[PDB]
Amino acid sequence: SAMEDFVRQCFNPMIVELAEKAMKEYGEDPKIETNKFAATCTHLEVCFMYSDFRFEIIEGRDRIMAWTVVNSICNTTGVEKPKFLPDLYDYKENRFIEIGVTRREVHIYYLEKANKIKSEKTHIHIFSFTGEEMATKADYTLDEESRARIKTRLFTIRQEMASRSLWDSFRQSERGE
Numbered sequence: 001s002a003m004e005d006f007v008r009q010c011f012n013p014m015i016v017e018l019a020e021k022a023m024k025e026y027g028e029d030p031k032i033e034t035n036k037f038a039a040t041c042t043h044l045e046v047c048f049m050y051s052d053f054r055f056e057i058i059e060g061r062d063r064i065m066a067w068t069v070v071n072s073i074c075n076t077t078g079v080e081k082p083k084f085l086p087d088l089y090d091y092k093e094n095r096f097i098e099i100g101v102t103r104r105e106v107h108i109y110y111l112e113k114a115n116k117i118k119s120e121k122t123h124i125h126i127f128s129f130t131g132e133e134m135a136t137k138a139d140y141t142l143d144e145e146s147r148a149r150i151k152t153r154l155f156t157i158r159q160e161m162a163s164r165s166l167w168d169s170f171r172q173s174e175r176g177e
């Protein structure tokens, strides 16, 4: 697959390894669901970048470790345990964060995410590949420079896919029919 080749050339080996592990843990084959493989790598990279600017990283851990970290936070802050695994915890605002990366309009994916979690407590932050974002209460958490770095990386991934004639397939596989 050209998409598997792109993933393994354009993503940090650590990202690729963790995304492969996450897909295996969740019974999906990176070699068949190749766009999903690219999506999980992209989202992981965004989560790491976000956390790197205050934050505990939940994403990128095996499931048992992720819930272990979540439980430890809830025990030491009294924040309520989320029903679904979030991506980060914010020690400044004392709230979990769900990060979404979408090839669709940010408002659509935001509504989908917010409908899934139904827990107002978890903060939602959505990024598109063209510099758009939508966040709970229009509170973007990060400053403008950090969000800019994230947006630039996402756009770069999109243009790399476009250079390789991969973007259209990737864009159409996010939502089913």
Ligand SMILES: O=C1c2c(O)c(=O)ccn2N([C@H]2c3ccccc3SCc3c2ccc(F)c3F)[C@@H]2COCCN12
Binding pocket: 022, 023, 024, 026, 027, 028, 036, 039, 040, 041, 043, 044, 059, 085, 086, 087, 099, 100, 101
């Ligand atoms: O943590 C996530 C997750 C998100 O954080 C997310 O934003 C969107 C989607 N997620 N999920 C995605 C995921 C993450 C990033 C990009 C696409 C996908 S698509 C389905 C899938 C995920 C992970 C492994 C796998 F094999 C999958 F099929 C699963 C949902 O259940 C808990 C873990 N997780």
Ligand SMILES: O=C1c2c(O)c(=O)ccn2N([C@H]2c3ccccc3SCc3c2ccc(F)c3F)[C@@H]2COCCN12
Binding pocket: 012, 014, 015, 045, 047, 048, 049, 051, 052, 057
């Ligand atoms: O900036 C960082 C970075 C730190 O600033 C840091 O404190 C710890 C770790 N970092 N790094 C990690 C990183 C940061 C946060 C959470 C997980 C990861 S894991 C691999 C990875 C990083 C960044 C982007 C990326 F695509 C990666 F695959 C890399 C080291 O050098 C260059 C940029 N960078």
Ligand SMILES: [Mn+2]
Binding pocket: 059, 085, 086, 087
């Ligand atoms: Mn996640």
Ligand SMILES: [Mn+2]
Binding pocket: 043, 087, 098, 099, 100, 101
């Ligand atoms: Mn997420």
